[PDB]
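Consider the following assembly input.
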Amino acid sequence: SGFRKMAFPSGKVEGCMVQVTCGTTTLNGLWLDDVVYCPRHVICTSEDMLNPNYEDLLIRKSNHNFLVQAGNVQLRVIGHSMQNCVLKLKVDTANPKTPKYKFVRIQPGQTFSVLACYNGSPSGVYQCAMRPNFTIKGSFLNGSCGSVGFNIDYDCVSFCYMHHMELPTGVHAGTDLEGNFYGPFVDRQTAQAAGTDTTITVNVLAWLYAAVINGDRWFLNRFTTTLNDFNLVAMKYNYEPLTQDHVDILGPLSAQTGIAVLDMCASLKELLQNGMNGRTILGSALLEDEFTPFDVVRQCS
Amino acid sequence: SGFRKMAFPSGKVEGCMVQVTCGTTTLNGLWLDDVVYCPRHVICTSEDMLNPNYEDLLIRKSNHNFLVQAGNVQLRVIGHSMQNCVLKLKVDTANPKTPKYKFVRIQPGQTFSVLACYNGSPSGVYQCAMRPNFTIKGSFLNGSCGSVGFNIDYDCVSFCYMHHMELPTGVHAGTDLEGNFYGPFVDRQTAQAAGTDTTITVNVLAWLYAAVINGDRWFLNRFTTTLNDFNLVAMKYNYEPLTQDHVDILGPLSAQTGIAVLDMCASLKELLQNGMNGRTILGSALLEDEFTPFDVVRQCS
């Protein structure tokens, strides 16, 4: 029993982290088979970041301008290309520690682990959610660029995220491993608006189910409610709309606890309308939304 | 910028996890050089756990009664011994993935990473604190016994914790890697009292310093206070007494923020006496105590 925000074991990803340098800039890259992937802004100076023409800046670079270091080993670059906002450096050796992997583009509200890295060396691991507005609230100090987010299915690593930048607001933005940004962001140091962020309703409900399984039941109510009634309450509190697809994903958890989803929505409604009166749920004084239904099921199982 | 509860990268520990079976019971072991370490209650049935005589139960066992499996590999046991509450199985091969390691016994209020494992295979990693009452609030399902807690100093892994049991209260208890329990607990399925748990004051202060560095300053006050005045407030709120050793450890953080420790205690006092008025600090509605001063410094650096 008990409930912690758990990350995937990071070992399979640690063996893929490398350091990439172009000119003066050093950041993290991901070495898989004979390709190294890193943020294309590695080729920019701090002055370039105001308004970079990446194609033009990349033109000034040849294979020998890219220093790729894996531990103490030096890799030889035999090709370079830009794919969207990522650089792909073809190297002459396959990474012997390449795990089974896929590149996936995750959906807002899904969770993943981040291995935060500096100069190609891992420093820490944490679990987070992609926010509905396609930002992440991470821990990214200078030189963490190129650190990656991932999920693990027994032996396959699904890479879903590469860190690129901190917005002026302090939240973080990045790409999938094909270099397409999540959300409206660009790799340019300019003012950039993230949308209003909403709370991930299906995750909150999943976590409430986690709480019941673990013995916290005070929030359970006499009331029930309807999908439209609840969504009225959600819209007011900047919770994302709950759909029947969400209700269905919560099915196994409803089965385990014997609590119907709409009964649990009515508890959430009262929570939203009345607050927590200084009480806690699973040790938290706020409604937690970075556990998916899948996360809760896997941790309990 | 930004602040997350970060665990150490788990790779060095993943390569040490094995599965140990004696009779019907299977749990996790730690394979380092040519020794496997696991909880001695691996040799107990569920009936044995009421009141086990470990010496007598161990007598009925010989080397070939202990099945040690590392992935698909099978290890050969050439010796067994009981050290306090841990069994040490001498095997015929050194673990080739043995990192540089030490065994350390940590102090209450210090933090470490846990690799939660089931049948010798890792499932998740999280960061936690040893509570002042020598329990941990973990995530330990059936078969997590023998999962280990650790810190990492660049390349050395310092093992500090092995999980043994869940108390009837839902909190967890375990040993150092010499088999000495943290706290008053025994490896017996009987009612066991944990002391009153207190909040780790020096960690809360460290986290407040983290908050200032990250831009949350609302809690900063006009007041200051004294060590004895503050400790009056701490005792009332079940916070552990703050000493000059603690004030000193907070020195680097006081230097970075230009805020004297006692000024920050006065902010904490007002927080403790007035609550948070529905506000948050670093995204939390409660005062967080599982970051040490060292944790905060390392993450900011």
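Chain A touches chain B through 43 residues (CB under 8 Å). Ask yourself how this observation constrains the way the partners meet.
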